[PDB]
Write a protein that holds these residues in place. Structure first.
Motif, short mmCIF file in Angstrom:
data_model
loop_
_atom_site.label_atom_id
_atom_site.label_comp_id
_atom_site.label_asym_id
_atom_site.label_seq_id
_atom_site.Cartn_x
_atom_site.Cartn_y
_atom_site.Cartn_z
N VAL A 1 0.84 -1.38 0.07
CA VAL A 1 -0.11 0.08 0.02
C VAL A 1 0.81 1.15 0.17
O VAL A 1 0.73 1.92 -0.86
CB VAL A 1 -1.00 -0.09 1.14
CG1 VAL A 1 -1.67 1.42 1.44
CG2 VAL A 1 -1.85 -0.99 0.98
N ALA A 2 1.88 1.12 0.94
CA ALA A 2 2.88 2.33 0.67
C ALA A 2 3.52 2.74 -0.34
O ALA A 2 3.60 3.73 -0.94
CB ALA A 2 3.74 2.17 2.08
N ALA A 3 3.75 1.60 -1.22
CA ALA A 3 4.50 1.79 -2.45
C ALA A 3 3.55 2.30 -3.41
O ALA A 3 4.19 3.20 -4.13
CB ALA A 3 5.00 0.44 -2.86
N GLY A 4 2.30 1.92 -3.25
CA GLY A 4 1.30 2.47 -4.30
C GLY A 4 1.15 3.76 -4.01
O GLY A 4 0.78 4.73 -4.84
N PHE A 5 1.32 4.10 -2.82
CA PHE A 5 0.73 5.70 -2.30
C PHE A 5 1.96 6.59 -2.67
O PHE A 5 1.48 7.85 -2.87
CB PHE A 5 0.58 5.63 -0.57
CG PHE A 5 0.61 7.13 -0.16
CD1 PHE A 5 -0.35 7.95 -0.74
CD2 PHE A 5 1.46 7.67 0.84
CE1 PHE A 5 -0.41 8.92 -0.11
CE2 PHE A 5 1.19 8.70 1.50
CZ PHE A 5 0.27 9.46 0.83
N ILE A 6 3.21 6.27 -2.82
CA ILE A 6 4.30 7.17 -3.26
C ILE A 6 4.84 6.98 -4.82
O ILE A 6 5.99 6.78 -5.10
CB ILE A 6 5.34 7.20 -2.41
CG1 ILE A 6 5.68 5.83 -2.24
CG2 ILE A 6 4.72 7.59 -0.92
CD1 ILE A 6 7.27 5.71 -1.45
#
Length: 427
Positions: free
Chosen positions: A319-324
């Motif tokens: 999710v974090a990878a997708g967020f940035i």
């Protein structure tokens, strides 16, 4: 060295080849499509079907492998599986020239050829490996799979860059063939059938397996395996493999479309996640043993703890990878962490089947894999349909749903897992 370890140094390379022929397309595809090799105008949904068609075959021949291996041994089964996989790999280009239909068909036949390996290996080790030593030989044999999904991506990138994508398939098929020749020349399905084995090794193996084999009781029958503690393993495996296959199949596309990485860099950086996973599943067993020595934990707390970790950490970091998105580095770091923490699962649901019902694992593995293979047939399809235009706002969605899948699977496992015995395995 000896015969069994030579077998385990020929199975390592066999599984290397298996996973390499499984993964090479994930890279070669990002160069086979259009915006010095030939380029085709595949749409979005079409790439998904191409990447998934392998599992539509992988799922068919998982359990039948256990029967065909006890019928005609494991040697010829594994040999012919690898050979068919490789020979079809050689033709994958000539197939692409003929359309997408033949390509998905060819990949599905590759899946039929590949899914019959693990059962054959289990069969061969049921006659080669002494009980006090199969934990090591199976590890040697199955580490080749991790090394393959690690190395087939860099090599595929190198080749696709300095040469056309066709040479990936040519090279890997030629390798599979040159390996099948050895598997045929040297290996045997049972020591008394081996042509160059020594008497003392044969007697050691047979004397180790004598009482074990003569103590088999649960072979000729099978009870009702619809206990909830099994559907927990199955669900956790389905959930983990959703993420794992979605990535294995669409991560190079992510790195080339969203991050805009070269193909060489793409193949080199798409190995770090699975290398981290290898290291983590190597250290996790050690850590779990040291933990069970530190405290009892009933052998179930370990399973559910490691499952929670290896199925939630991935969710968070993904999710974090997708967020940035659109950041060259941090996204790679987060995908690496995500697929690295996923190695703790090798001490959770991927092993609970030995504590829930041993002496029946031969079929519980088949059930679990046949159920957790569906995501390979689905994920690469919807993960690409939701992204007709590779905008970060689309990929964030597939990351979110994959993380939710992982989370629900972990919750299910933690709720309904058992770790001692399920009362019908008692011989």
């Amino acid at each position: 060295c000896s015969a069994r370890y030579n077998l385990a140094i020929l199975a390592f390379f066999g599984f290397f080849i298996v996973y390499a022929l499984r993964v090479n397309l994930s890279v070669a595809l990002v160069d086979m499509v259009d915006s010095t090799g030939k380029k085709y105008q595949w749409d979005a949904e079409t790439q998904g079907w191409i990447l998934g068609s392998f599992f539509y075959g992988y799922i068919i021949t998982q359990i039948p492998g256990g029967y065909v291996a006890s019928k005609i041994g494991g040697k010829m089964l594994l040999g012919f599986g690898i050979l068919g996989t490789a020979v079809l790999t050689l033709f994958t280009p000539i197939a692409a020239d003929l359309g997408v239909g033949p390509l998905i068909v060819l990949r599905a036949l590759e899946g039929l050829g590949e899914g019959v390996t693990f059962p054959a290996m289990h069969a061969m080790w049921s006659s080669w490996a002494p009980p006090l030593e199969r934990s090591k030989l199976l590890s040697i044999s199955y580490a080749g799979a991790q090394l393959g999904t690690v190395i087939s991506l860099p090599l595929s990138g190198i080749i696709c860059y300095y040469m056309n994508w066709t040479y990936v398939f040519y090279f890997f098929g030629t390798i599979g063939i040159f390996w099948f020749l050895l598997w045929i020349w040297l290996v045997s399905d049972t020591p008394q059938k081996h042509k160059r084995i020594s008497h003392y090794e044969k007697e050691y193996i047979l004397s180790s397996l004598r009482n074990q084999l003569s103590s088999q009781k649960s072979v000729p029958w099978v009870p009702i395996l619809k206990s909830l503690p099994l559907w927990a393993i199955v669900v956790a495996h389905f959930s983990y493999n959703w993420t794992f296959y979605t990535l294995l199949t669409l991560l190079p596309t992510y790195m080339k479309e969203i991050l805009r990485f070269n193909v060489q860099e793409n193949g080199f950086l798409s190995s770090l996640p699975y290398l981290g996973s290898w290291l983590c599943m190597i250290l996790s067993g050690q850590a779990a043993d040291n933990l069970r020595a530190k405290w009892n934990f009933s052998t179930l707390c370990v399973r559910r703890i490691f499952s929670l970790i290896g199925m939630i950490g991935p969710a968070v970091f993904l999710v974090a990878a997708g967020f940035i998105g659109c950041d060259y580095s941090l996204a790679v770091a987060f995908l690496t962490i995500s697929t690295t923490l996923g190695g703790f699962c090798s001490s959770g649901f991927s092993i609970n089947h030995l504590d829930i019902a041993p002496s029946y694992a031969g079929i519980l593995l088949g059930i679990t894999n046949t159920f957790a293979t569906i995501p390979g047939m689905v994920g690469p399809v919807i993960a690409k349909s939701l992204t007709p235009d590779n905008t970060v706002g689309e990929w964030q969605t597939v990351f979110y749903i994959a993380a939710a899948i992982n989370v629900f699977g972990a919750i299910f496992f933690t709720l309904f897992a058992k770790g001692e015995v399920q009362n019908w395995a008692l011989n």
